[PDB]
Amino acid sequence: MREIVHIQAGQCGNQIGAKFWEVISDEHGIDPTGSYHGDSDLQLERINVYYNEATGNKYVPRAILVDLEPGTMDSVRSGPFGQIFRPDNFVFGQSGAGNNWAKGHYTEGAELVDSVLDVVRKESESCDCLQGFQLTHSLGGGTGSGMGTLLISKIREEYPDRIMNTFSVMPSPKVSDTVVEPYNATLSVHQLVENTDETYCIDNEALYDICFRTLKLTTPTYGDLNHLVSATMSGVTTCLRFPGQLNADLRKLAVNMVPFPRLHFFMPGFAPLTSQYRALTVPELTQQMFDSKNMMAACDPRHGRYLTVAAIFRGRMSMKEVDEQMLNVQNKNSSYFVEWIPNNVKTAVCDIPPRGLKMSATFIGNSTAIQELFKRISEQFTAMFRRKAFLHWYTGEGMDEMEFTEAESNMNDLVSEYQQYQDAT
Amino acid sequence: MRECISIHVGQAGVQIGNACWELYCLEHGIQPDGQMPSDKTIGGGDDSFNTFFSETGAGKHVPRAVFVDLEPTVIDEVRTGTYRQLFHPEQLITGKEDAANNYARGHYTIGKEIIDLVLDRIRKLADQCTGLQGFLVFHSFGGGTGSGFTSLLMERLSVDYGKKSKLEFSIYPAPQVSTAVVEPYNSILTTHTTLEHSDCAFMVDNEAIYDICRRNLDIERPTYTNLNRLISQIVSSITASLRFDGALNVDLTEFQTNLVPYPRIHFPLATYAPVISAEKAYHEQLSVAEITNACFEPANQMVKCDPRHGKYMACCLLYRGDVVPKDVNAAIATIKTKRSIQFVDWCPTGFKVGINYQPPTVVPGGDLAKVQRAVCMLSNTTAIAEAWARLDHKFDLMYAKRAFVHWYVGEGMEEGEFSEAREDMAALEKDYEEVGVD
Amino acid sequence: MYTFVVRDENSSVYAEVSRLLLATGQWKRLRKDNPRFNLMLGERNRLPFGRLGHEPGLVQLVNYYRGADKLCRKASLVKLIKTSPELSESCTWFPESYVIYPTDEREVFLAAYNRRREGREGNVWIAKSSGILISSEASELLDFIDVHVIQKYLEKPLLLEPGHRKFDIRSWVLVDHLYNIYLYREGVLRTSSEPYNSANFQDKTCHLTNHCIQKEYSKNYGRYEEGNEMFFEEFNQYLMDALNTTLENSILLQIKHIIRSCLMCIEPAISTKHLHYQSFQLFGFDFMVDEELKVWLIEVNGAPACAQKLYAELCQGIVDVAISSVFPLASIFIKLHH
Amino acid sequence: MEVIELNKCTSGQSFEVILKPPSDPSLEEIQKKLEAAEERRKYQEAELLKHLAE
Ligand SMILES: Nc1nc2c(ncn2[C@@H]2O[C@H](COP(=O)(O)OP(=O)(O)OP(=O)(O)O)[C@@H](O)[C@H]2O)c(=O)[nH]1
Ligand SMILES: Nc1ncnc2c1ncn2[C@@H]1O[C@H](COP(=O)(O)OP(=O)(O)CP(=O)(O)O)[C@@H](O)[C@H]1O
Ligand SMILES: Nc1nc2c(ncn2[C@@H]2O[C@H](COP(=O)(O)OP(=O)(O)O)[C@@H](O)[C@H]2O)c(=O)[nH]1
Ligand SMILES: [Ca+2]
Ligand SMILES: [Ca+2]
Ligand SMILES: [Ca+2]
Ligand SMILES: [Mg+2]
Ligand SMILES: [Mg+2]
Ligand SMILES: [Mg+2]
């Protein structure tokens, strides 16, 4: 009974968090009313990791929904699985955050964080042995970004020996709401560098390219982007939700993926990605799984080196062939795997595939090429900060320019740290 | 009669121990409920099989075993397994959260909080023993519990049972089935701390067992169940002398006397044969010379290495089945005139042989086929240092960058213990080279 | 695509093999410390055999036989021939040799030395090790050593005419992972450009056929043949015109016999037949020929260098016989059967 | 080959074949190291809480 407490904050966080629970609920045989109607005991063997068991044999997701505006959360409560969430776990305000990190972190958010921690405490107090926390949010907005990182700081203070894991959507000018997204993302990244053990970097720029280029969606929507995130989130959590030997919990995953404490930002990848009945052979899953076009961070892996990699194959397939193909990828491109971490590629196999697929593969890589993501954000930040453009939105909430300079310096350090290990021999 | 207590630590130790006691019951005719019809002394006795099994007034034969794991899911399978009736709750010890493949977490953080409980449960078994010989400790090298908590348990055992012997059955890490990148760290950390507390340790490299299963059993992707059934056969061959009537290796002290002249060099190489697939109806039964000759093939060793490029310090042959001394000596003569067998000058070139007429027992429905005769060679050869060299190299690669070191310091371990443990392995490699190289 | 690493930058032979492998377009060279390789062109000293064959899904091959140093060392070769029953103390194709330390064989060496002195037989010996001294008095030899070997210096060597000069025959032998013994059809006679003078052994220019000593101390370097190197075609023609015989009958039969005896002796100790990795290795045998057309084994080189005119052919043969046999892509050798 | 010390029983026999003759820390010290590591953890956590308090 290694429980995980899920938290989703802000518009993006709640819309992607809702899809996540809709997806894994279907995989575990849970219906929109919390009643289980599956046909395999594997669906319930580790159901307690994400679900509470209530009266009448109901399964209640261990999820906490947070937002400074009630708008998006009202959609969740009315969505497909809206009735499955614990009503008391809906914590929301009324003012909003106006895509402003300062409002979510210092003013508007500070007023609501205590009531969120009360709900987190109630969930933890019923956990036989709490593993840690899983937060979904974006970095470009105000609530998920500003208040999300505030929650993480206060969760760490109250549970310093627990693992903190986040799915963090990075902003991109291709799929942008406001011009201040680089400001908000740069301020959040430093918080994540200190107060998370594992962060999946989901780049809206990559999600858009995949929808437009690969899936052939000429006018991608947020729903289209969230389809890729749901499939990726289901994949990266497979080893946590089903019986297995590798990365079976959050702490063992961190031990296998994080050789240095600050370099814990992962590139997720998913396969297949079809624009749909054809069978996908194991060699095809492996090649597509490692192809940059299947990465969710918009970073070219061949531009850096892999510190560690976690692969997960789902479905009924030859494990001998999985081992052979995985060994073929490493042995045929060993120049992209750091030589000072022997056997840094670990593979897992789950028999239960995702919905609508005979088999699939999820990629989790700790590559030094992730610096290209932070460089991109760093450049956009500086383009505006060099002229102090749009700063009044933040100084008006009590922030000083020095805090921006420090956030800028912190992310340049993070970029430098990735660079030194990309050269290391 | 002197009792032996088996201690199983971590997933590897527990699952292997579960497979061993299943084989013991089959060998000794003990049923899953603990009853033993052939045992006419009800509720007592000092027979050879009593070194591993105690007896209740109701005639149940209870293993003198303790299972320890910082996570409950693995030991729970023992509580609800086929031989669940053999054990009682006091024998099974589980925690809430495991060591997360972190030696420091298993040794310092979690070990400090559960060590007293384990010793107390072990004390209960020792109180039943009229003359305890010592302990057999099953564990892995790469796991956080098997490495970290085992070294703490071994240290305390030397304190609470100073005169008792301790033998190890250790699982050497193999990437083909390994579950953590830091397993080289845990292997060297636990070997350093445990070196001065183990009288004799049998290393089993999962790579060797894995290939033996694929090659000789026709298993495409061997599982832990496949690996553990083969390992239990090896362990059974090594402990049979303690559980059956005989004159060779009749007590734990005799293992050190026959296999370990130098205390630090106490890692005998195990070679087993024959391994025949049960999926084939008929198979040409191998003779004494053929199975004895197989003991000198690296493909049958528990640790892949080349004894030709080393030196022997001692060599024991443990036969089970239709084997008479005449055939053994004849086969040894042929092998000498064909094999590269070199002993150190300060040791006699010879073989201590033990024969048990009862042929090997195989789990009904398993993968190993019944055979008329089998042998396990226990040879203390310097060639096994190749395993230390491989392990120390991977350690050097990661530690040069301090990769993953922060996970250990975060648990209260000082970074100096790393280099302290590595320097000990460096001395160990040097001892092997001085003993078997010119 | 097959992968390989290079760990001996000073190897002229395998520097060509590596160049050939790359030219095939089907082989890829990795960093010298990358373990995910199919082939290792290992270093001369302390090659980590213990770390080979532990890479899942990688058939690994190395270009050196672990333990072959017994044959490729002065003192080791002597000990192997005396103690090995297959070669026996009664070995007829190996000069009488003894190992002397500065166990030891000092007293045994002087024993046979006194016997020759009384019988008036040629009692000249040569001391060498892995700096040489050729003397007729044993006292000078032992004083010079203060690990060396002393063997009977062949005082009646076959001398080529014109020139009245000494020489030695170098044979390249390739042993593959299956332990097939392949003798390169092309040899080289490293001749002395100075006339043999059995009067004063101090002038070693005419007594040492080394290619370097002839180019540094010999005044007639390259006079008779380019680089004091005579190949089998010319040497065979000479044997026909001079001694009315062929190179095959008079010498090559004994050379093949000696190569088999040495390699088949150590096969049980170095064979990689049932090992987790496979080995091959190129050897350099050096023979002496006396006036009776008897072949004598001088030593065996474990890391030999090829002749300039033969690098292309031989190196290409190493790829076909030793490498491509284990890693096939998309005869110049004489197979010595056994 | 010299066979020595041959012992026989109903379940088997044993013997030796010669081919050629030859040519701890105290309980207190452990408790200290365990408590020393525990103290280093308490110090690191205190620094974290101090950092978070700032
Ligand atoms: N032969 C064999 N090896 C095993 C088995 N289980 C785990 N291992 C090996 O043990 C190593 C990991 O150690 P574990 O025993 O699983 O971990 P642990 O001792 O429970 O310690 P924790 O980190 O707290 O879980 C890996 O190299 C595995 O290959 C098993 O049942 N049989
Ligand atoms: N027993 C002997 N009788 C006559 N000449 C001998 C001899 N031993 C050596 N020589 C001469 O000395 C030369 C060099 O000897 P040796 O081969 O032992 O040294 P080396 O290892 O430096 C050369 P290489 O490595 O090419 O064989 C030989 O080419 C040979 O002409
Ligand atoms: N993938 C994805 N990204 C989103 C979604 N909604 C908003 N975003 C991104 O998140 C950023 C805006 O943050 P938002 O969640 O709206 O701010 P918040 O509600 O104050 O936390 C922008 O970069 C958007 O591109 C969504 O549903 N899916
Ligand atoms: Ca207010
Ligand atoms: Ca009894
Ligand atoms: Ca002791
Ligand atoms: Mg918004
Ligand atoms: Mg465990
Ligand atoms: Mg030489």
Side-chain angles (χ1 to χ4, degrees):
Chain A
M1 306 177 186
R2 292 288 286 164
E3 299 83 357
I4 296 179
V5 172
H6 172 90
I7 307 175
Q8 55 191 54
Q11 178 172 29
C12 178
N14 274 274
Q15 288 176 344
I16 289 185
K19 306 298 295 185
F20 169 74
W21 286 102
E22 174 180 0
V23 174
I24 71 168
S25 293
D26 169 67
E27 294 185 8
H28 292 275
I30 307 302
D31 65 3
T33 57
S35 302
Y36 168 82
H37 290 294
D39 62 330
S40 174
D41 284 355
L42 295 70
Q43 296 177 312
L44 296 178
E45 191 159 347
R46 304 239 283 177
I47 195 68
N48 47 270
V49 175
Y50 282 95
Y51 293 88
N52 287 320
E53 191 167 356
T55 307
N57 206 20
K58 290 285 186 177
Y59 292 95
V60 178
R62 193 174 302 101
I64 307 177
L65 299 73
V66 181
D67 204 345
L68 293 169
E69 293 172 339
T72 299
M73 279 180 50
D74 286 342
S75 301
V76 175
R77 185 182 298 101
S78 303
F81 285 71
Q83 309 293 306
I84 197 180
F85 295 107
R86 191 174 188 267
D88 280 351
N89 289 21
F90 289 78
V91 180
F92 55 91
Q94 296 290 338
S95 60
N99 291 304
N100 187 323
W101 194 86
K103 292 182 174 181
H105 201 87
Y106 289 129
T107 58
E108 309 295 332
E111 184 174 0
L112 182 73
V113 61
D114 278 5
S115 52
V116 174
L117 292 177
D118 290 335
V119 182
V120 175
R121 188 176 302 97
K122 183 279 174 184
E123 292 294 351
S124 298
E125 293 178 351
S126 57
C127 286
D128 170 64
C129 191
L130 172 69
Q131 302 185 38
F133 307 85
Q134 159 187 121
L135 170 68
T136 55
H137 67 147
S138 70
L139 304 190
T143 299
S145 184
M147 185 186 182
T149 54
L150 178 65
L151 279 173
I152 290 178
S153 182
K154 289 180 171 294
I155 285 181
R156 183 179 183 182
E157 188 179 19
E158 192 167 350
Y159 311 89
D161 61 349
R162 303 298 79 177
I163 294 292
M164 173 62 63
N165 176 76
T166 71
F167 301 82
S168 299
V169 179
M170 313 296 180
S172 172
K174 297 180 180 181
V175 186
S176 175
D177 295 348
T178 66
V179 299
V180 296
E181 292 169 347
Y183 281 159
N184 300 325
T186 294
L187 295 164
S188 290
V189 166
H190 180 57
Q191 302 296 310
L192 302 181
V193 171
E194 286 188 345
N195 296 327
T196 76
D197 303 297
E198 305 152 332
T199 290
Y200 301 97
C201 296
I202 304 178
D203 188 353
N204 265 11
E205 184 167 334
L207 302 179
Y208 189 93
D209 295 327
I210 294 177
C211 289
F212 182 82
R213 299 171 178 170
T214 297
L215 303 182
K216 299 306 174 184
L217 299 179
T218 65
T219 306
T221 67
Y222 277 131
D224 294 329
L225 281 54
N226 295 340
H227 167 75
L228 297 171
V229 184
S230 296
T232 294
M233 297 190 64
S234 172
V236 306
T237 61
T238 293
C239 293
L240 306 169
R241 302 185 282 106
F242 296 93
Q245 290 288 317
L246 181 67
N247 303 325
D249 62 70
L250 296 176
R251 185 168 297 275
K252 276 185 174 181
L253 175 66
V255 172
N256 285 337
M257 296 292 293
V258 180
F260 307 96
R262 286 180 295 273
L263 313 188
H264 56 259
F265 301 90
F266 305 150
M267 291 180 51
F270 185 86
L273 295 172
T274 298
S275 58
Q276 55 183 356
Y277 312 105
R278 177 189 179 184
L280 204 64
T281 66
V282 172
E284 298 174 349
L285 272 180
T286 307
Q287 290 186 350
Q288 300 178 19
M289 177 183 54
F290 281 91
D291 187 359
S292 64
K293 301 196 296 290
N294 295 73
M295 307 286 172
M296 309 282 170
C299 297
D300 193 353
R302 307 180 81 93
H303 294 179
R305 307 190 68 186
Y306 287 108
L307 301 173
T308 59
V309 174
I312 304 82
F313 293 79
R314 305 189 61 180
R316 303 182 67 262
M317 66 194 67
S318 174
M319 195 169 186
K320 187 176 83 70
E321 196 176 20
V322 170
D323 297 332
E324 298 185 12
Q325 294 300 328
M326 286 304 296
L327 299 179
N328 181 269
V329 172
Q330 311 176 61
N331 298 332
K332 288 189 59 60
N333 309 282
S334 59
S335 60
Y336 295 102
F337 300 84
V338 301
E339 63 287 353
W340 36 279
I341 298 182
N343 314 101
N344 59 6
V345 184
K346 300 304 180 183
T347 298
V349 176
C350 181
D351 301 333
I352 300 182
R355 191 175 191 263
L357 294 178
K358 287 297 180 63
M359 53 182 50
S360 59
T362 299
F363 172 88
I364 305 177
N366 189 350
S367 170
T368 64
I370 194 63
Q371 65 170 299
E372 295 183 336
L373 190 166
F374 300 114
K375 285 184 178 178
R376 192 188 67 195
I377 298 297
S378 184
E379 297 177 348
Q380 307 162 354
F381 172 98
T382 293
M384 297 181 300
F385 188 67
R386 63 179 178 181
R387 305 291 289 265
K388 300 181 180 181
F390 306 98
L391 268 184
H392 71 96
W393 295 125
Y394 298 83
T395 58
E397 301 297 320
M399 289 189 63
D400 187 75
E401 299 185 358
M402 186 58 60
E403 183 164 347
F404 283 78
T405 305
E406 296 175 344
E408 178 182 30
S409 302
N410 294 150
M411 196 157 60
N412 290 341
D413 293 349
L414 180 63
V415 177
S416 297
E417 188 170 358
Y418 280 110
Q419 182 60 30
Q420 75 177 77
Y421 294 113
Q422 180 174 314
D423 302 324
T425 56
Chain B
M1 189 284 300
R2 307 187 68 197
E3 301 84 1
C4 286
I5 297 178
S6 295
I7 307 177
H8 314 283
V9 185
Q11 174 175 306
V14 168
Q15 295 189 157
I16 292 174
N18 210 24
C20 290
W21 291 102
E22 178 192 26
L23 190 53
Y24 295 162
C25 294
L26 297 178
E27 296 180 356
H28 294 286
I30 298 176
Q31 301 169 355
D33 60 327
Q35 292 292 323
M36 183 178 182
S38 60
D39 181 7
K40 303 308 175 183
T41 46
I42 303 299
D46 56 2
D47 295 316
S48 291
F49 69 90
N50 284 124
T51 62
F52 280 58
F53 296 88
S54 62
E55 308 181 27
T56 65
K60 173 182 292 183
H61 300 59
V62 187
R64 309 179 187 271
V66 179
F67 297 79
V68 189
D69 199 2
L70 307 183
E71 168 226 357
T73 71
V74 176
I75 283 185
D76 286 332
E77 298 184 15
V78 180
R79 300 190 178 101
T80 63
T82 298
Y83 296 91
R84 59 187 180 276
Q85 305 181 51
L86 295 177
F87 317 90
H88 45 92
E90 292 79 22
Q91 302 178 265
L92 311 185
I93 307 175
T94 56
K96 288 294 183 178
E97 55 185 359
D98 60 26
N101 294 319
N102 188 336
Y103 171 93
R105 189 171 178 93
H107 183 89
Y108 296 98
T109 301
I110 297 179
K112 176 185 184 300
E113 303 294 324
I114 192 179
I115 181 62
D116 292 326
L117 175 64
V118 175
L119 294 180
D120 183 75
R121 297 298 168 85
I122 296 177
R123 177 60 62 184
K124 287 184 179 180
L125 296 185
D127 290 349
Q128 289 186 118
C129 305
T130 61
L132 178 64
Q133 302 184 37
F135 307 89
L136 311 184
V137 187
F138 301 74
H139 65 103
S140 62
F141 271 1
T145 297
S147 69
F149 179 79
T150 298
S151 68
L152 177 56
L153 178 62
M154 296 286 292
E155 285 182 323
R156 291 296 302 273
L157 290 183
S158 298
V159 171
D160 299 12
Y161 307 88
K163 302 299 175 58
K164 278 60 177 60
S165 295
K166 295 194 292 291
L167 281 61
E168 283 183 306
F169 295 90
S170 303
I171 299 307
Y172 181 99
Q176 259 170 326
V177 297
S178 73
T179 54
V181 183
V182 298
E183 298 203 17
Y185 282 170
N186 300 334
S187 303
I188 289 174
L189 291 173
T190 191
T191 297
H192 166 55
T193 296
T194 307
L195 197 51
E196 272 297 54
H197 303 278
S198 182
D199 298 310
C200 182
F202 301 102
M203 282 192 300
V204 182
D205 186 350
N206 272 345
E207 183 193 49
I209 305 301
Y210 192 84
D211 285 334
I212 298 181
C213 285
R214 287 197 300 182
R215 193 192 322 106
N216 298 334
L217 294 180
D218 289 329
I219 312 300
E220 306 200 64
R221 175 58 166 85
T223 62
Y224 284 147
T225 302
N226 304 133
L227 301 181
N228 294 344
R229 287 208 177 106
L230 178 59
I231 297 175
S232 63
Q233 291 294 338
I234 320 304
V235 177
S236 177
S237 295
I238 302 176
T239 68
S241 59
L242 301 169
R243 303 177 286 114
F244 295 94
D245 190 1
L248 180 64
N249 297 343
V250 64
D251 59 9
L252 297 181
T253 295
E254 194 165 352
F255 280 86
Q256 178 275 319
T257 292
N258 292 333
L259 297 168
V260 187
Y262 289 167
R264 275 173 64 89
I265 308 299
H266 61 253
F267 298 89
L269 177 67
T271 311
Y272 188 85
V275 179
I276 303 301
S277 174
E279 292 296 323
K280 53 176 57 183
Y282 175 88
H283 186 91
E284 300 170 353
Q285 294 293 0
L286 302 181
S287 65
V288 173
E290 292 177 326
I291 69 175
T292 300
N293 187 27
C295 291
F296 299 88
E297 293 294 352
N300 301 320
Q301 301 167 356
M302 300 311 96
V303 181
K304 288 186 178 181
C305 58
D306 200 338
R308 293 175 302 174
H309 298 91
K311 289 182 180 177
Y312 291 90
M313 290 163 289
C315 192
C316 295
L317 291 169
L318 307 177
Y319 295 87
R320 302 179 74 172
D322 179 56
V323 180
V324 296
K326 177 182 56 182
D327 300 326
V328 180
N329 297 328
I332 292 180
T334 301
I335 294 177
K336 271 303 303 178
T337 66
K338 281 183 168 57
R339 293 289 189 178
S340 302
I341 307 175
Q342 277 295 329
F343 279 74
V344 296
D345 298 330
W346 50 276
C347 287
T349 304
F351 301 84
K352 284 184 176 63
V353 182
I355 297 179
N356 189 284
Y357 292 149
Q358 181 172 304
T361 303
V362 297
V363 175
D367 292 319
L368 295 181
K370 182 77 173 186
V371 298
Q372 293 298 348
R373 66 193 63 81
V375 59
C376 177
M377 190 173 71
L378 303 181
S379 58
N380 196 340
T381 167
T382 59
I384 208 172
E386 300 177 20
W388 299 130
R390 303 159 47 201
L391 207 58
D392 289 334
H393 182 59
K394 298 182 178 177
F395 184 104
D396 287 352
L397 288 176
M398 291 190 298
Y399 192 75
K401 308 295 182 301
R402 298 301 186 267
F404 304 95
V405 169
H406 68 282
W407 289 109
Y408 297 73
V409 178
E411 295 293 357
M413 200 180 89
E414 312 193 75
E415 182 166 322
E417 184 164 352
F418 274 98
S419 62
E420 167 187 328
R422 180 58 178 90
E423 297 180 8
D424 194 6
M425 298 300 308
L428 191 63
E429 288 202 43
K430 192 173 184 177
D431 301 332
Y432 279 100
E433 189 178 19
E434 301 182 12
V435 174
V437 185
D438 310 335
Chain C
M1 183 173 298
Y2 304 113
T3 60
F4 71 98
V5 305
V6 177
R7 298 170 65 93
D8 183 0
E9 294 292 1
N10 301 332
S11 172
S12 54
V13 168
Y14 290 95
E16 172 64 2
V17 172
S18 177
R19 194 280 294 181
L20 292 176
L21 296 178
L22 295 173
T24 68
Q26 310 180 24
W27 280 86
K28 178 180 182 299
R29 174 174 178 175
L30 310 174
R31 307 186 186 95
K32 62 186 302 179
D33 297 320
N34 191 336
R36 301 185 175 278
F37 59 88
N38 289 120
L39 169 64
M40 168 183 295
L41 310 186
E43 58 282 41
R44 286 188 178 187
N45 305 123
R46 299 194 66 91
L47 193 166
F49 298 97
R51 303 208 300 263
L52 298 171
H54 300 279
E55 285 297 341
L58 280 180
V59 180
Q60 291 191 320
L61 176 67
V62 61
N63 69 332
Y64 278 100
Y65 264 98
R66 191 182 185 187
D69 49 309
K70 267 58 181 178
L71 190 71
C72 304
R73 247 70 190 190
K74 301 294 194 304
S76 297
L77 174 57
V78 181
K79 174 190 175 184
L80 179 64
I81 291 181
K82 293 186 174 182
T83 58
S84 292
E86 310 92 30
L87 309 180
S88 73
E89 168 193 4
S90 60
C91 187
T92 59
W93 45 257
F94 186 70
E96 184 184 18
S97 307
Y98 301 95
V99 179
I100 304 299
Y101 286 98
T103 58
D104 196 72
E105 292 177 330
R106 277 180 174 267
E107 304 176 358
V108 185
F109 158 72
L110 302 178
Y113 181 89
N114 305 329
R115 197 184 312 175
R116 281 186 160 274
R117 182 175 179 178
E118 181 185 11
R120 301 183 181 183
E121 298 183 355
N123 207 15
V124 177
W125 297 75
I126 181 179
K128 50 182 180 177
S129 65
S130 299
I132 306 80
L133 174 58
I134 312 178
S135 175
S136 61
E137 274 291 338
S139 58
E140 284 195 10
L141 300 181
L142 298 182
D143 298 5
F144 173 87
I145 297 181
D146 302 325
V147 183
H148 278 245
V149 301
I150 299 179
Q151 66 177 181
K152 183 64 187 63
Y153 180 89
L154 309 181
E155 304 178 18
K156 293 186 175 183
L158 183 62
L159 302 183
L160 303 177
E161 303 299 354
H164 196 76
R165 50 204 181 100
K166 195 175 184 176
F167 70 90
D168 73 322
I169 298 179
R170 158 64 67 85
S171 295
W172 292 281
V173 180
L174 175 62
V175 181
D176 64 6
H177 60 291
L178 306 181
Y179 218 90
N180 289 324
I181 304 178
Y182 297 100
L183 169 61
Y184 186 21
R185 85 162 84 98
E186 298 292 348
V188 298
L189 283 71
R190 292 169 295 187
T191 64
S192 174
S193 51
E194 301 297 337
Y196 180 81
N197 179 257
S198 58
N200 294 16
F201 300 105
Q202 299 303 338
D203 191 332
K204 305 183 300 179
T205 301
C206 75
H207 298 279
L208 287 59
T209 63
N210 297 81
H211 184 280
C212 65
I213 295 181
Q214 294 297 334
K215 195 172 185 178
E216 288 286 349
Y217 295 90
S218 182
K219 295 183 178 181
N220 301 329
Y221 178 85
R223 175 181 182 177
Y224 307 90
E225 49 278 339
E226 184 175 355
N228 285 15
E229 295 185 352
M230 181 188 302
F231 296 91
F232 282 180
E233 182 178 7
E234 173 179 344
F235 179 53
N236 178 77
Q237 186 63 227
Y238 170 82
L239 292 178
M240 296 189 301
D241 304 330
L243 287 301
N244 188 24
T245 183
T246 67
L247 173 63
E248 167 66 28
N249 294 16
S250 64
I251 301 177
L252 215 57
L253 286 180
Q254 301 169 70
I255 289 183
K256 291 179 292 182
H257 171 70
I258 296 179
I259 297 176
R260 287 194 186 98
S261 303
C262 294
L263 290 177
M264 300 306 293
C265 177
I266 62 178
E267 176 179 5
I270 72 174
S271 177
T272 65
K273 187 179 179 181
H274 299 145
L275 206 61
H276 37 286
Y277 70 90
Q278 298 298 329
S279 296
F280 67 92
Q281 184 171 352
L282 177 70
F283 295 89
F285 285 75
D286 297 325
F287 303 93
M288 277 288 300
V289 186
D290 66 3
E291 62 185 23
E292 306 291 340
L293 288 184
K294 178 179 178 178
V295 176
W296 301 84
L297 177 61
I298 300 303
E299 80 162 12
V300 183
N301 286 271
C306 185
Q308 176 57 19
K309 185 185 66 176
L310 306 178
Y311 271 102
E313 192 177 30
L314 173 57
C315 292
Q316 172 57 213
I318 298 180
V319 176
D320 301 331
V321 178
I323 298 178
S324 295
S325 59
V326 182
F327 314 102
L329 297 177
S331 178
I332 67 175
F333 295 107
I334 307 174
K335 183 177 180 179
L336 304 184
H337 296 90
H338 54 76
Chain D
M1 295 193 175
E2 186 180 7
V3 179
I4 70 179
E5 301 183 349
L6 175 66
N7 302 99
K8 302 173 59 185
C9 64
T10 299
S11 54
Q13 52 186 308
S14 58
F15 60 97
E16 184 176 9
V17 188
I18 300 183
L19 305 181
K20 176 200 303 179
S23 302
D24 295 326
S26 64
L27 172 58
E28 177 181 359
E29 299 170 353
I30 295 180
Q31 284 294 326
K32 291 181 182 178
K33 291 188 178 180
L34 288 182
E35 297 177 352
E38 179 182 20
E39 212 61 16
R40 288 184 294 270
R41 285 191 307 273
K42 298 178 181 179
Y43 175 83
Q44 301 167 4
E45 172 168 321
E47 290 298 308
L48 173 58
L49 299 183
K50 186 195 312 301
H51 181 76
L52 293 181
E54 294 177 347

